[PDB]
Amino acid sequence: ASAYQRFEPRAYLRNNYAPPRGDLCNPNGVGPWKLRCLAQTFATGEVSGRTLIDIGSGPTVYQLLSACSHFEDITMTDFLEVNRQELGRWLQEEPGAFNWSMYSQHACLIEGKGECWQDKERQLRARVKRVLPIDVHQPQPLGAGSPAPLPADALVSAFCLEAVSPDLASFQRALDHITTLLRPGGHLLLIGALEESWYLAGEARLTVVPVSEEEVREALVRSGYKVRDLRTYIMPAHLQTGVDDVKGVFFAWAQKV
Amino acid sequence: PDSAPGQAAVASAYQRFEPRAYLRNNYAPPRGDLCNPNGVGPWKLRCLAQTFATGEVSGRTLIDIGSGPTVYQLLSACSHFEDITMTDFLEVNRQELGRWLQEEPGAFNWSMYSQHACLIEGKGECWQDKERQLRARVKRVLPIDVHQPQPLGAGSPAPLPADALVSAFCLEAVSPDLASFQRALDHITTLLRPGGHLLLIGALEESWYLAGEARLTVVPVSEEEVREALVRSGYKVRDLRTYIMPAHLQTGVDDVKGVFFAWAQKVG
Numbered sequence: 033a034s035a036y037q038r039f040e041p042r043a044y045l046r047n048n049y050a051p052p053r054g055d056l057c058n059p060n061g062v063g064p065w066k067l068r069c070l071a072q073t074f075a076t077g078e079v080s081g082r083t084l085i086d087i088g089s090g091p092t093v094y095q096l097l098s099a100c101s102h103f104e105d106i107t108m109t110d111f112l113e114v115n116r117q118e119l120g121r122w123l124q125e126e127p128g129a130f131n132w133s134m135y136s137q138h139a140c141l142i143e144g145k146g147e148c149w150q151d152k153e154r155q156l157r158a159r160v161k162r163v164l165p166i167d168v169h170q171p172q173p174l175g176a177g178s179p180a181p182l183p184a185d186a187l188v189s190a191f192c193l194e195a196v197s198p199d200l201a202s203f204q205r206a207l208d209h210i211t212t213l214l215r216p217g218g219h220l221l222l223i224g225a226l227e228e229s230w231y232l233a234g235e236a237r238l239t240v241v242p243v244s245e246e247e248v249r250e251a252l253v254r255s256g257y258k259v260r261d262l263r264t265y266i267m268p269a270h271l272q273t274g275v276d277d278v279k280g281v282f283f284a285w286a287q288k289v
Numbered sequence: 290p291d292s293a294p295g296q297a298a299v300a301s302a303y304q305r306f307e308p309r310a311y312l313r314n315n316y317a318p319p320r321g322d323l324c325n326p327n328g329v330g331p332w333k334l335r336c337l338a339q340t341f342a343t344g345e346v347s348g349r350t351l352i353d354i355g356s357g358p359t360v361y362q363l364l365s366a367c368s369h370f371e372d373i374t375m376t377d378f379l380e381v382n383r384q385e386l387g388r389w390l391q392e393e394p395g396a397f398n399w400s401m402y403s404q405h406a407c408l409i410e411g412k413g414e415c416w417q418d419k420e421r422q423l424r425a426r427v428k429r430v431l432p433i434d435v436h437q438p439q440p441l442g443a444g445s446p447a448p449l450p451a452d453a454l455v456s457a458f459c460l461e462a463v464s465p466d467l468a469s470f471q472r473a474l475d476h477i478t479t480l481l482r483p484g485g486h487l488l489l490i491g492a493l494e495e496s497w498y499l500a501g502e503a504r505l506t507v508v509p510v511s512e513e514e515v516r517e518a519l520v521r522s523g524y525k526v527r528d529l530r531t532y533i534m535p536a537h538l539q540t541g542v543d544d545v546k547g548v549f550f551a552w553a554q555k556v557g
């Protein structure tokens with residue numbers, strides 16, 4: 033765990049969200065795939081409500097671009113202060129903010145509603161009410177008197193759980209922990225690395241539990257979800273860059289029962 | 290009577306035309322605000338996009354008539370033509386384009402327009418790809434004078450005759466009056482092959498617009514005057530639509546009351 037105290041936000045953003053993995057121009061890349069999964073799911077009109085919490089946001093906002101038009105109250109979270117500050121810099125249009133515009137643009141493209149990317153960002157910035165500390169290893173990840181409206185109508189979490197868990201069972205428990213934040217009948221969108229064991233964030237080398245699609249499925253079932261959808265993206269050779277050993281990416285749409 | 294005097298006045302007036310001020314006036318916000326779907330920028334792009342989306346306007350060669358310092362008018366066109374000719378009377382506009390072609394930072398930024406075009410064409414094309422393709426398909430930037438019987442001159446570089454023409458806010462902006470406008474339409478029609486297409490966009494009932502120090506005189510035209518001229522020139526009008534300029538978009542940079550878009554096909 034303590035490895036996360038060397039985690040450099042800018043290095044992680046560079047490693048994953050700048051070219052080559054950050055090139056959205058190629059439709060077969062991982063960036064467009066992730067956005068596509070997010071957009072298609074909300075376009076169904078079945079993931080809706082008032083409040084949403086993003087679990088382990090890190091310094092990234094892309095995972096909420098499509099979500100933001102279905103939820104008026106959004107809570108972003110991370111274990112690290114540096115990440116929350118990086119988020120704050122973008123949410124407040126402060127200096128040095130990461131440029132997410134290509135992603136906003138592509139979400140607008142994919143969604144096909146004719147929306148300009150600036151409106152999309154305006155709405156996202158406006159519906160994120162708070163950026164809060166969080167530790168999924170804790171039975172109450174948000175703590176006791178959290179400002180976050182609970183229970184949430186929906187959850188999003190991308191590349192958090194497996195990346196904070198030494199093994200399957202720890203992964204399963206963290207899942208159990210965040211699931212308590214979710215209202216019954218609510219929805220979870222879970223995104224994560226498949227069969228990954230490490231990734232780099234500057235000086236930080238993080239351990240990851242290698243999970244499979246079937247393991248992810250079973251974990252959700254054991255937690256009280258019906259899996260509405262689970263798709264896999266296989267990482268092409270050209271996006272295997274030395275920043276990690278991720279083999280593929282899973283997308284899960286789960287509904288708490 | 291005789292065309293020299295007015296054409297002389299026009300040529301004289303454009304010696305003061307400032308591309309940057311014009312770019313700022315029409316293509317930066319508020320008129321350059323692509324977020325409001327009711328705005329004129331989105332309408333113009335939408336007219337182009339929808340027309341090319343029919344699949345009915347295709348071929349090898351396209352000529353843009355009176356390009357000025359702008360490229361937006363070719364964003365949807367560029368996927369349908371291998372060879373694109375851009376053109377203008379003023380060297381300064383041609384250099385402006387040269388600055389965009391070379392992908393210089395000093396160039397005017399059209400990326401909002403590229404993105405919006407990508408957005409409305411609905412193929413999930415990224416804007417850098419659209420731009421890269423426009424830059425590849427523009428084979429030449431030429432001097433042009435629409436008042437000349439041979440607008441491009443004698444033995445021009447352009448592959449003649451073209452399969453399609455585009456022209457935005459040129460003819461009316463350089464014609465002291467209607468007969469001048471008609472003659473200009475007639476002159477550019479000689480560049481188009483029979484059965485070919487002209488996409489014509491322009492200001493309605495405009496008598497002046499500003500380009501820095503230069504204050505240019507425009508012949509005020511109606512939709513019906515536009516239609517008749519096209520018929521008069523040997524076209525069938527396939528589409529003619531009108532945008533009424535919203536009050537909030539009348540900014541003192543001109544007295545334009547509306548914009549027209551004509552899709553016309555040359556009889557032959």
Ligand SMILES: Nc1ncnc2c1ncn2[C@@H]1O[C@H](CSCC[C@H](N)C(=O)O)[C@@H](O)[C@H]1O
Nearest residue numbers: 088089090092111112167168190191192196
């Ligand atoms: N014990 C813990 N509980 C909850 N989140 C944690 C955690 N330890 C580390 N994290 C956060 O988990 C994130 C993994 S990477 C950020 C993923 C981001 N959501 C995106 O989609 O790319 C990091 O931000 C990290 O700081």
Ligand SMILES: Nc1ncnc2c1ncn2[C@@H]1O[C@H](CSCC[C@H](N)C(=O)O)[C@@H](O)[C@H]1O
Nearest residue numbers: 355356357359378379433434435457458463
């Ligand atoms: N005699 C002439 N023949 C052809 N084009 C001319 C001309 N005199 C001026 N022009 C060009 O007509 C343009 C009018 S402004 C329109 C520019 C651009 N097509 C747009 O859509 O914004 C200017 O670029 C001007 O220099």
Ligand SMILES: Nc1ccc2ncccc2c1
Nearest residue numbers: 048062191225231276278
């Ligand atoms: N460790 C990570 C985090 C995010 C990713 N997104 C796409 C592909 C691989 C990824 C690895």
Ligand SMILES: Nc1ccc2ncccc2c1
Nearest residue numbers: 315329458492498543545
């Ligand atoms: N003189 C001009 C040139 C371009 C325009 N585009 C939209 C509206 C008015 C316009 C006037």
